[PDB]
Design an enzyme around this catalytic site. Structure first.
Site, mmCIF file in Angstrom:
data_model
loop_
_atom_site.group_PDB
_atom_site.id
_atom_site.type_symbol
_atom_site.label_atom_id
_atom_site.label_comp_id
_atom_site.label_asym_id
_atom_site.label_seq_id
_atom_site.Cartn_x
_atom_site.Cartn_y
_atom_site.Cartn_z
ATOM 1 N N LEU I 38 0.831 -1.188 0.000
ATOM 2 C CA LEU I 38 0.000 0.000 0.000
ATOM 3 C C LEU I 38 0.874 1.250 0.000
ATOM 4 O O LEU I 38 2.084 1.193 0.220
ATOM 5 C CB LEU I 38 -0.930 -0.013 1.206
ATOM 6 C CG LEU I 38 -1.710 -1.303 1.419
ATOM 7 C CD1 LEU I 38 -2.485 -1.231 2.711
ATOM 8 C CD2 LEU I 38 -2.636 -1.569 0.253
ATOM 9 N N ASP I 39 0.249 2.390 -0.264
ATOM 10 C CA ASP I 39 0.949 3.668 -0.207
ATOM 11 C C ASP I 39 0.434 4.496 0.959
ATOM 12 O O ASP I 39 -0.371 4.025 1.753
ATOM 13 C CB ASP I 39 0.789 4.431 -1.518
ATOM 14 C CG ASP I 39 -0.649 4.737 -1.837
ATOM 15 O OD1 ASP I 39 -1.176 4.170 -2.814
ATOM 16 O OD2 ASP I 39 -1.254 5.546 -1.111
ATOM 17 N N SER I 40 0.901 5.733 1.059
ATOM 18 C CA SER I 40 0.594 6.562 2.207
ATOM 19 C C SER I 40 -0.840 7.091 2.174
ATOM 20 O O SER I 40 -1.390 7.423 3.245
ATOM 21 C CB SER I 40 1.594 7.711 2.278
ATOM 22 O OG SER I 40 1.474 8.505 1.137
ATOM 23 N N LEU I 41 -1.455 7.165 1.000
ATOM 24 C CA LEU I 41 -2.860 7.543 0.915
ATOM 25 C C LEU I 41 -3.732 6.394 1.393
ATOM 26 O O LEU I 41 -4.759 6.609 2.025
ATOM 27 C CB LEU I 41 -3.243 7.937 -0.510
ATOM 28 C CG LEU I 41 -2.746 9.292 -1.006
ATOM 29 C CD1 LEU I 41 -3.095 9.460 -2.459
ATOM 30 C CD2 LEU I 41 -3.331 10.422 -0.199
ATOM 31 N N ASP I 42 -3.316 5.166 1.084
ATOM 32 C CA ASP I 42 -4.006 3.997 1.619
ATOM 33 C C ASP I 42 -3.914 3.957 3.134
ATOM 34 O O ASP I 42 -4.890 3.629 3.815
ATOM 35 C CB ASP I 42 -3.414 2.721 1.033
ATOM 36 C CG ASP I 42 -3.699 2.567 -0.437
ATOM 37 O OD1 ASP I 42 -4.736 3.070 -0.903
ATOM 38 O OD2 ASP I 42 -2.886 1.931 -1.132
#
Ligand SMILES: CCCCCCCCCCCCCCCCCC(=O)OC[C@H](COP(=O)(O)OCCN)OC(=O)CCCCCCCCCCCCCCCCC
Ligand SMILES: CCCCCCCCCCCCCCCCCC(=O)OC[C@H](COP(=O)(O)OCCN)OC(=O)CCCCCCCCCCCCCCCCC
Ligand SMILES: CCCCCCCCCCCCO[C@@H]1O[C@H](CO)[C@@H](O[C@H]2O[C@H](CO)[C@@H](O)[C@H](O)[C@H]2O)[C@H](O)[C@H]1O
Ligand SMILES: CCCCCCCCCCCCO[C@@H]1O[C@H](CO)[C@@H](O[C@H]2O[C@H](CO)[C@@H](O)[C@H](O)[C@H]2O)[C@H](O)[C@H]1O
Ligand SMILES: CCCCCCCCCCCCO[C@@H]1O[C@H](CO)[C@@H](O[C@H]2O[C@H](CO)[C@@H](O)[C@H](O)[C@H]2O)[C@H](O)[C@H]1O
Ligand SMILES: CCCCCCCCCCCCO[C@@H]1O[C@H](CO)[C@@H](O[C@H]2O[C@H](CO)[C@@H](O)[C@H](O)[C@H]2O)[C@H](O)[C@H]1O
Ligand SMILES: CCCCCCCCCCCCO[C@@H]1O[C@H](CO)[C@@H](O[C@H]2O[C@H](CO)[C@@H](O)[C@H](O)[C@H]2O)[C@H](O)[C@H]1O
Ligand SMILES: *C(=O)CCCCCCCCCCCCC
Lengths: 459, 79, 126, 67, 56, 155, 103, 121, 84, 171
Positions: I38-42
């Site tokens: 996942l990324d930081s928005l997730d």
């Protein structure tokens, strides 16, 4: 009055001849006995005053002031014995002697029949009070508070001496009973204007009148607890008592000579009530609150009506118990955290529940919740000043609002919110402190049941 | 101690979350939290009354208890 | 519509143009401010957590504040145009204003009474 | 307790709460229907409102113009 | 009059009693809330007597 | 607390300014006294005129209720800016626009009430009629005098 | 944007202590060590006796023998008298009204 | 409603003034006009302690209803017929006031119409 | 009346209804970026779903550090005085 | 103080919470939350910092225009309806030292365990102070961060007021 003067004097040898560890027990017990006997002064008649002798008399004005005076002495002793515990024995006895001599001068001041005898005792109170503040005050500024207190008073009191002596030469007597029958009207003239000012300025400084009040917050912040109690409860009322008597011989000139002082008081009460909203020192807040409360008394005395004179007497008695209680409440915090900053220790209701109840009742009396005698006296003055001029209800009403705001600001700031984390020496309230608070409020609330005994001679 | 119902039973099919999934699919987008909201649309929560139905709660029995009462009142009105 | 800040409604931080532009000089100041805060926090905590400390932790910041709000005012007060103008516009003007309001009202009422035109039919309490 | 919490599911109900709720809902609707059947005048008006334009000039005492 | 004026005053006196008891003259902390609720209910009943006399 | 750690007179030289900043626990670049009028501020710092409500509620303040840290300089008007008093937080609507809409709404209502008082609503009916000379005696009329006879006729 | 190795370790150490402190807040079984329908009606009959009957006796005695012995303490609105009524004190009979027209 | 639009938005000289009406003699166009008959006496309304606003030309029905209410206590659903009779008498009283308003309006209209005849001539 | 295991059970329940996470790979120690991709928005969306689940706010400064299910469990347990 | 990434992610969280306040209904919120995510994804890979900062500033201006005037607040969060509700019941642990002996006698076991904690606090204090001294830069601490314990038997410096803080529901 010898039945009160002599036992008061005997408190001195009792203190000095007491065992070392019994000076507080003995003086408190016997000063409470004297207070008990002071109720015999309540033999007041509908027409005539109670005239004991050629020197002393008592009427419905001096009687409540005497009972309050003799009641305060045992309270002051209880309030003082903790911070004086490390003092050496001779200086403790000297401190008590100053309190006893103050009571001696005060009961004589309130019953003196002759105005020059009243003057001498009215000035004699300066000496013990000054000594208490400057000797047993805690901070460097007590020396300057003593000088401001001394010279403000003398600045007005010396002209009073000249005016009183002049009156005696012109009228032939300063006996208050004689002045009631021999009084003559005062005709307009520059000489009589300054006679009026000389007769009244000394009492105006004692109240204190707004503009001449800067000595009072100094004196309180520097005085020991007993110094504040007598200063607030009784000494301020010397000015009101003197005005209530001297105004007899100043009519009709008071009709227009009152105006500048009514404007100072009417506007001053609003200014000093608003100042209380921003005070950072708890003792200074309460001292400023007294100036606001006594502004009402000055207005009531100056407009000279039966309702206003009854309101003034109730207000003087009610303020004495309330203001003294507030100082004792602030002092109990001070004996724990050793600071007078209001914001320092907060949320104290969480740590001292019963003490928070005393704070609530003292605040409720300070904002004159009906039917407390605080409200009865304040309401009577408002009723009388409205007849004097309807517009005054705007100033009186606005002051009621600001008074509630600063009374509850004091309560919310110290008792409510979150307790200060780093303050960890809030020990539980002592029996001595709880008893001290209850001996203020209980007589105050009981007086609601029988207000007539504190409404004065116009009742 | 507490028993959690099996997570696999939460499906968006047959619920308004399926309508959103088609509206997003037209734009190339997709909703990843759909099954986290599916419990609110199934089970005892599947069908709730309209506003009119909420006001008419108890009207059926209030009407029957009323038709009887007026019917009884008329019968006594002829005796 | 741009935000119009007022005395009683500050500009939101997220709308402040300064925040988004951070130079190395600014970041130096921010670090230097955090150094002071951390130094004071340590000095406070080493007393706050001391198991043998029973009392109040005196805060010189609080002492300076109460001192400034009273003791330090007159020594640093100068009587210039501003002080006298404010001093006279709010220390004697209100007294004059109220004197004329009340004197005018009382003279009007005294005149009415002397002619018997003020209604005091049931007025026997004063 | 007698009612235990549930996770992501409709809560457990008792008969007493459901029946008492239905009784007072039907009580309300009977009361409205019963009161309306008898006191519809409280809603629709108690007396007729006359149309003043239908009053003759004889009863209003309006004389003819030529007088 | 004797019943009307007496009952109208017992209603108010009845309400003060739980306050006075809280001065520990007779203290029952176990269920003070139930005590206060019971006093209100009895005050309601005794107040309905002078109300009925007024309606009559 | 020594005299050197207490507020002093307005700082005149840069050396005095640096000393004041250190005394108040501030950066010399951040420290700024009040204007040297005669109002008696001394060298007490002029900090931003912001409510304590504007401060971050999640940071671990030493005084969480005040949102102050021990040792940090207190605003001159800290007592006015406590969370129970004057709030300066940013508002969703501009302050000037709020004053216009509030004032406009009040001004419009007052105007319409004047209109409604000038042109009141009423029903098309004549005065209510009362017997016995418009209840002359009941209303408190003097029995001895004689009222003008009020007469109401049928219609 | 995660914890550092030393933040993880401190948080873990305080976690262990905090949970041991919370466990120690539970009371032991013996704590606190304390110093040494007909029922429904009876409890309601005694409440009525001490909170209604006794106060009403006190008030009735107070009103009957102390308040109503002084003038104008309890003042009543005089009873309404209608046509056709009979006055108890005197026996007088109030006449009926003039006869109503039809309506 | 309608009457207010005419006065405020139309001709107001031909509209009744609720605060000054009537402005024509009660005998104008009314030969031999009869006085209203009060059934209840002043003493009867004084002893019944009727509120002054209630001491009007329907007071006799109100007195009869009030007596029934007291006699029927605790049955508080009785005296419906007595109450209605008072309500009906008040309705007729109100209708008479409505006629006085319409009479005043038509006399005002008749007058202005007569002035144009004179103004034209 | 939360329990340590109860908090863990619900933290994993929410993540298993997240379509961007494979329910079979998910474990308590799975790092949202390193292990789940996942990324930081997730990560923000996950923390918001945890606030909704337990009905209290995790401030951004603290929330940005919770990078695995176990760290969320420890945070919630610490905030709610859960010791068992 | 806050990096660019920190500012963007705070804006994303803030925008979603205000969007939810507008939408209310879950299906409507899920729809517009995915459109909002797609707007942040349109510039995820923007590499020019000046371009990215411009986007962030305009997004914050757009947020201010469209923010809910009355957003949802979690009840215990700052500004919430239950915020600080239970502070009046939070009594510090040092208050127990002032209890009367008859009061302590009612909880013999609790107060025995409290003595152990006070004993643990006394014996650990000097090491905590020593550790803080030897790990702090010369000028003084540059941040408010505190270290863990390094040795077995050591407690993390400055632990007492964290470990013994009042419970969040203290009564
Ligand atoms: C300022 C000085 C005021 C001078 C007053 C004065 O000299 O009056 C003299 C005059 C004496 O004349 P006599 O024959 O006795 O009676 C007829 C009056 N012409 O009449 C009098 O003696 C009346 C004067 C009474 C005594 C006045 C006492 C001194 C007043 C000066 C101080 C007043 C202000 C005090 C302010 C203090 C405030 C802190
Ligand atoms: C005669 C007039 C007398 C005027 C006296 C007015 C005193 C002014 C208050 C002085 C400040 C005292 C300290 C109180 C304070 O500052 O509290 C601020 C308080 C904040 O409350 P809040 O808005 O709810 O925000 C809380 C969320 N953090 O907010 C408040 O509580 C302040 C509320 C007072 C604001 C003034 C309201 C006066 C309104 C007068 C106009 C209406 C005239 C009467 C109606 C006309 C007749 C129809
Ligand atoms: C020619 C005329 C002279 C008239 C004199 C009349 C009084 C004469 C008194 C002489 C006796 C005084 O006694 C002397 O004073 C005090 C007071 O009691 C005594 O001792 C005192 O110690 C302390 C305080 O001082 C107290 O416990 C208590 O007051 C007393 O016991 C001395 O130990 C004693 O030496
Ligand atoms: C209005 C009627 C009554 C007026 C009475 C006025 C007379 C003066 C009364 C106070 C006398 C005190 O005597 C002296 O006063 C001055 C200020 O006034 C004080 O001076 C104080 O403030 C000055 C500057 O404001 C400082 O330089 C000084 O360090 C400080 O002590 C002295 O410390 C005090 O010793
Ligand atoms: C806080 C401070 C308060 C200060 C209050 C100041 C009050 C001011 C009062 C003004 C009235 C003074 O008293 C007034 O003086 C004038 C002289 O000037 C006197 O005037 C008298 O002598 C003059 C001589 O020229 C004659 O013309 C006049 O016929 C005669 O009345 C009045 O008899 C008296 O009414
Ligand atoms: C000036 C008029 C004064 C009238 C004085 C009358 C004196 C009568 C003394 C009665 C003493 C009752 O003392 C008080 O009563 C209540 C209810 O009865 C009792 O309270 C108890 O009963 C109530 C019943 O609802 C319950 O809450 C619970 O079982 C318990 O609290 C306690 O015993 C005591 O709190
Ligand atoms: C049943 C309710 C009956 C009463 C209803 C009363 C509603 C009356 C509201 C009157 C107040 C309207 O106030 C008016 O609002 C508009 C809308 O921004 C403002 O309009 C102006 O401000 C906006 C916003 O800054 C700008 O786009 C532009 O400068 C201009 O449109 C006016 O400057 C203001 O005077
Ligand atoms: C006719 O009797 C009108 C009764 C009042 C109607 C009120 C409805 C809203 C405002 C209209 C009143 C007209 C004002 C001239």
């Amino acid at each position: 009055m010898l039945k009160y003067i002599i036992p008061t004097i005997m408190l001195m040898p009792l203190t000095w001849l007491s065992k070392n560890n019994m000076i507080w027990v003995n003086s408190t017990a016997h000063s409470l006995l004297i207070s008990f006997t002071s109720l015999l002064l309540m033999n007041q008649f509908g027409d005539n005053s109670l005239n004991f002798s050629l020197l002393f008399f008592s009427d419905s004005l001096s009687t409540p002031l005497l009972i309050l005076t003799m009641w305060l002495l045992p309270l002051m002793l209880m309030a003082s014995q903790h911070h004086l515990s490390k003092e050496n024995l001779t200086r403790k006895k000297l401190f008590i002697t100053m309190l006893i001599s103050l009571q001696l001068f005060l009961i004589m001041t309130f019953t003196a029949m002759e105005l020059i005898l009243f003057y001498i005792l009215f000035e004699a109170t300066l000496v013990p009070t000054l000594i208490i503040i400057t000797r047993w005050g805690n901070q460097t500024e007590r020396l300057n508070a003593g000088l401001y207190f001394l010279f403000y008073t003398l600045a007005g009191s010396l002209p009073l001496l000249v005016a009183l002596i002049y009156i005696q030469n012109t009228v032939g007597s300063l006996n208050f009973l004689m002045l009631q029958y021999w009084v003559q009207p005062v005709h307009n003239s520059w000489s009589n204007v300054f006679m009026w000012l000389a007769c009244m300025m000394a009492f105006m400084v004692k109240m204190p009148l707004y503009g001449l009040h800067l000595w009072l917050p100094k004196a309180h912040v520097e005085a020991p607890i007993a110094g504040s109690m007598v200063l607030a409860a009784v000494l301020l009322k010397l000015g009101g008592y003197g005005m209530l008597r001297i105004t007899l011989i100043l009519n009709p000139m008071t009709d227009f000579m009152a105006y500048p002082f009514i404007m100072l008081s009417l506007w001053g009460m609003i200014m000093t009530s608003s100042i209380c909203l921003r005070q950072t020192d708890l003792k200074s807040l309460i001292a400023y609150s007294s100036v606001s409360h006594m502004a009402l008394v000055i207005v009531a005395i100056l407009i000279q009506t039966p309702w206003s004179y009854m309101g003034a007497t109730a207000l003087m008695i009610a303020h004495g118990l309330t203001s003294s209680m507030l100082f004792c409440l602030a002092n109990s915090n001070y004996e724990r955290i050793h600071s007078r900053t209001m914001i320092l220790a907060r949320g104290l209701q969480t740590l001292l529940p019963l003490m928070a109840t005393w704070w609530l009742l003292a605040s409720l009396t300070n904002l004159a919740l009906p039917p407390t005698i605080n409200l009865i006296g304040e309401l009577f003055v408002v009723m009388s000043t409205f007849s004097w001029s309807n517009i005054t209800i705007i100033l009186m009403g606005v002051n009621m609002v600001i008074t509630a705001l600063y009374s509850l600001y004091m309560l919310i700031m110290t008792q409510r919110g979150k307790y200060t984390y780093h303050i960890n020496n809030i020990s539980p309230s002592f029996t001595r402190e709880n008893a001290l608070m209850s001996l203020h409020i209980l007589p105050l609330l009981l007086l609601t049941l029988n207000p007539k005994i504190i409404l004065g001679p116009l009742y | 101690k507490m028993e959690l119902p099996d997570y696999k039973q939460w499906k968006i099919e047959g619920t308004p979350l399926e309508t959103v999934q088609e509206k997003l699919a037209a734009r190339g987008l997709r909703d990843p939290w759909g099954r986290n909201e599916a419990w609110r649309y199934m089970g005892g929560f599947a069908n709730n009354v309209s506003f009119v139905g909420a006001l008419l709660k108890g009207f059926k029995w209030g009407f029957a208890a009323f038709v009887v009462a007026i019917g009884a009142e008329y019968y006594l009105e002829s005796q | 519509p741009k935000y119009e800040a007022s005395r009683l409604s500050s500009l939101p931080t997220t709308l402040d143009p300064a925040e988004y532009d951070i130079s190395s000089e600014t970041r130096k100041a921010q670090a230097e401010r955090l150094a002071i805060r951390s130094r004071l926090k340590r000095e406070y905590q080493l007393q706050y957590y001391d198991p043998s400390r029973r009392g109040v932790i005196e805060d010189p910041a609080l002492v300076r504040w109460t001192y400034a709000r009273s003791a330090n005012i007159y020594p640093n007060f100068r009587p210039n145009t501003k002080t006298s103008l404010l001093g006279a516009l709010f220390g004697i003007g209100p007294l004059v204003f109220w004197y004329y309001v009340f004197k005018t009202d009382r003279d009007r009422k005294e005149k009415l009474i002397q002619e018997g035109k003020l209604d005091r039919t049931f007025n026997i309490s004063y | 307790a007698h009612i235990e919490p549930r996770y992501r599911q409709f809560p457990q109900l008792t008969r007493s709460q459901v029946i008492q709720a239905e009784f007072f809902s039907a009580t309300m609707w009977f009361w409205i229907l019963w009161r309306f059947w008898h006191d519809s005048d409280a809603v629709l008006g108690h007396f007729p409102y006359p149309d003043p334009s239908q009053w003759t000039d004889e009863e209003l005492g309006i004389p003819p113009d030529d007088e | 009059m004797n019943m009307f004026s007496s009952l109208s005053l017992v209603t108010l006196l009845l309400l003060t009693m739980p306050i006075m008891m809280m001065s520990f003259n007779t203290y029952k902390p176990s269920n003070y809330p139930l005590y206060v609720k019971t006093a209100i209910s009895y005050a309601f009943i005794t107040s309905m007597i002078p109300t009925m006399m007024f309606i009559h | 607390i020594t005299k050197d750690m207490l507020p002093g007179p307005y700082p005149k030289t840069p050396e005095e300014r640096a000393a004041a900043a250190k005394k108040y626990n501030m950066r010399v670049e951040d420290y700024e006294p009040y204007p040297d009028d005669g109002t008696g501020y001394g060298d007490y710092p002029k900090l931003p005129d912001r409510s304590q409500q504007e401060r971050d509620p999640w940071y671990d303040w030493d005084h969480p209720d005040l949102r102050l840290n021990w040792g940090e300089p207190m605003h001159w008007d800290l007592d006015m800016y406590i969370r129970n008093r004057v709030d300066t937080s940013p508002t969703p609507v501009n302050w000037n626009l709020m004053c216009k809409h509030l004032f406009g709404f009040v001004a419009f209502m007052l105007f319409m009430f004047w209109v409604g008082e000038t042109y009141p609503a009423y029903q098309p009916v004549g005065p209510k009629q009362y017997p016995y000379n418009n209840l002359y005696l009941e209303r408190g009329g003097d029995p001895n005098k004689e009222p003008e006879p009020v007469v109401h006729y049928e219609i | 944007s995660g914890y550092t190795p030393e933040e993880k370790l401190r948080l873990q150490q305080l976690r262990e202590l905090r949970r041991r402190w919370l466990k120690d807040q539970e009371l032991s079984p013996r704590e606190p060590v304390l110093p040494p329908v007909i029922y429904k009606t009876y409890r309601h009959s005694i409440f009525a006796f001490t909170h209604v009957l006794i106060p009403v006796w006190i008030i009735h005695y107070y009103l009957k023998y102390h308040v109503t012995t002084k003038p104008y303490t309890i003042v009543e609105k005089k009873p309404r008298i209608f046509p056709g009524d009979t006055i108890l004190e005197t026996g007088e009979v109030i006449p009926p009204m003039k006869e109503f027209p039809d309506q | 409603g309608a009457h207010l639009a005419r006065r405020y938005l139309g001709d107001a000289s031909v509209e009744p003034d609720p605060l000054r009406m009537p402005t024509f003699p009660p005998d104008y166009g009314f030969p031999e006009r009869k006085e209203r008959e009060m059934v209840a006496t002043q003493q009867e309304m004084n002893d019944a302690q009727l509120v002054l606003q209630q001491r009007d030309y329907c007071a006799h029905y109100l007195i009869r209803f009030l007596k029934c209410k007291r006699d029927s206590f605790p049955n508080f659903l009785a005296c419906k017929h007595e109450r209605h009779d008072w309500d009906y008498c008040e309705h007729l009283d109100y209708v008479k006031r409505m006629k006085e308003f319409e009479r005043e309006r038509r006399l005002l209209q008749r007058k202005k119409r007569r002035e144009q005849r004179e103004a034209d001539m | 009346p939360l329990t340590l295991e109860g908090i863990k059970d619900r933290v994993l329940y929410v993540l298993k209804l997240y379509d961007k996470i494979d329910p079979e790979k998910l474990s308590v120690n799975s790092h949202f970026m390193k292990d789940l991709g996942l990324d930081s928005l997730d990560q923000v969306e996950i923390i918001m779903a945890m606030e909704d689940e337990f009905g209290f706010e995790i401030p951004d400064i603290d929330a940005e550090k919770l990078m695995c299910p176990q760290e969320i469990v420890d945070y919630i347990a610490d905030k709610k005085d859960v010791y068992e | 103080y806050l990096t660019h990434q920190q500012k963007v992610l705070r804006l994303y969280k803030r925008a979603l919470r205000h969007l939810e306040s507008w939408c209310i209904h879950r299906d409507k919120y899920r729809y517009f939350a995915c459109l909002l995510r797609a707007r942040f994804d349109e510039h995820k890979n923007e590499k020019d910092m000046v371009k990215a900062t411009q986007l962030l500033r305009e997004a914050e201006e757009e947020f201010w225009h469209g923010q809910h005037p009355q957003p949802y607040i979690f009840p215990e969060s700052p500004g919430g309806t239950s915020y600080e509700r239970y502070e009046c019941y939070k009594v510090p642990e040092w208050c127990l030292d002032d209890w009367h002996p008859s009061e302590k006698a009612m909880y013999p076991d609790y107060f025995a365990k409290r003595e152990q904690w006070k004993k643990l606090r006394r014996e650990s204090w000097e090491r905590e102070v020593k550790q803080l001294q030897e790990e702090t830069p010369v000028g003084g601490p540059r941040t408010e961060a505190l270290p863990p314990a390094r040795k077995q038997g050591d407690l993390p410096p400055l632990w007492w007021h964290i470990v013994t803080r009042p419970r969040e529901r203290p009564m």
